Swiss-Prot record, chains A, B:
This is E3 ubiquitin-protein ligase UHRF2. The lineage of its organism: Eukaryota, Metazoa, Chordata, Craniata, Vertebrata. It comes from Homo sapiens (Human). May be autoubiquitinated; which may lead to proteasomal degradation. Phosphorylated. Phosphorylation may be mediated by CDK2. The YDG domain recognizes and binds 5-hydroxymethylcytosine (5hmC). The chain holds residues 441 to 642 of 802 of the full protein. Residues 1-188 are annotated as: Methyl-CpG binding and interaction with HDAC1. Induction: Up-regulated in proliferating fetal lung fibroblasts and in U-937 myeloid leukemia cells. Down-regulated in these cells by growth arrest and differentiation. In other cell types which cannot leave the cell cycle, such as tumoral HT-1080 and Hep-G2, levels are consistently up-regulated. E3 ubiquitin ligase that plays important roles in DNA methylation, histone modifications, cell cycle and DNA repair. Acts as a specific reader for 5-hydroxymethylcytosine (5hmC) and thereby recruits various substrates to these sites to ubiquitinate them. This activity also allows the maintenance of 5mC levels at specific genomic loci and regulates neuron-related gene expression. Participates in cell cycle regulation by ubiquitinating cyclins CCND1 and CCNE1 and thereby inducing G1 arrest. Also ubiquitinates PCNP leading to its degradation by the proteasome.
Length: 188, 188
DNA sequence: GTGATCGAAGTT
DNA sequence: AACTTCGATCAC
């Protein structure tokens, strides 16, 4: 339906949509990789990402959250560099950079998984929930507090006309459209 | 239908049956893990295994083949110990052991994947093929020729009344039962 | 085809 | 519930 390098929201899929399995999200076109947390291209940008609480030192305030790139020190390559390119700022592989106009940054589809409940209060009760479009305000390398190795950190800030699922308006909208947890066809 | 610790062939499923994906094999009960190559229990034995050519130094003569346990030296624990228990011989975590009566060993369901074509001429053209029951003749630790680290090796020998799929009789049987590559229901 | 990956079942 | 584990997809 849509190309793999599609930026922005997927047509016909409103914020609050929830799928049980990652493969459902892949077939839906929201997040193509079956396993990988980040969908993007190293010489273009990042198209989507998933919060599944993989890092104990990550935070989540809903409108803003931190993200970590994918036994050794991490580097700004592949998906990490892809995510870095979305930031409206010159690329800096040493100390990172901060966007001058964060809203000018490339749009990123953000999906929160229930697995993130161990680090995030905004994680859904079940499955994987599309929470909308976020943008990279800044990024920088740092030593991870959870395993002592260097990791790349990213700041994501929400910029979407669609109301957040945890907000009253988002609740009213999710209820209005009867958005509920969808299992695969004929699931036991 | 059957317990997870079931030894021997799965009822109603003849040798030569082929599925495209591992998940099909999991749901069929032939090999429960979705990813893992070995299905067994560390304090009981091994129930099934998959040949997908993961090790370049493995061999396959059809009736007999070598298998390797799952950056560092391997140990005789978990699935490896499980596979070791199937051998009719005292457990030896130093130099391994050789069965006195290999036919007395515990039965192991063996599934060959097309991925094994790079090392095995017996690997199927497509998907994953159940080739029947094998038994562990012996096992021993050795330095892997493909990455220089210590690995545990296993010798499997076929003992099944059902004819092998590559044999004339197995061909005639597979043809007779119209056994062909099965895709998941409603696959594009 | 080679290299990469915040997924699900099973065992423990 | 934590750990172990020879898939499926898309990026290069």
């Amino acid at each position: 339906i849509v190309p793999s390098n599609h930026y922005g929201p997927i047509p016909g899929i409103p914020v609050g949509s929830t799928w049980r399995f990652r493969v459902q999200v892949s077939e839906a076109g929201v997040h193509r990789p079956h396993v990988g947390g980040i969908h993007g291209r190293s010489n273009d940008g990042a198209y989507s990402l998933v919060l599944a609480g993989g890092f104990a030192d990550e935070v989540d305030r809903g409108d803003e959250f931190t993200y970590t790139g994918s036994s050794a020190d991490q580097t700004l390559t592949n998906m990490n560099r892809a995510l870095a390119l979305n930031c409206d700022a010159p690329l800096d592989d040493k100390i990172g950079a901060e966007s001058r106009n964060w809203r000018a940054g490339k749009p990123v589809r953000v999906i929160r998984s229930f697995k993130g409940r161990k680090i995030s209060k905004y994680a859904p009760e079940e499955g994987n929930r599309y929470d909308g479009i976020y943008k990279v305000v800044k990024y920088w390398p740092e030593i991870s507090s959870s395993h002592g190795f260097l990791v790349w950190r990213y700041l994501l800030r929400r910029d979407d006309v669609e109301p957040a699922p945890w907000t009253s308006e988002g609740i009213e909208r999710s209820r209005r459209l009867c958005l509920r947890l969808q299992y695969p066809a004929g699931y036991p």
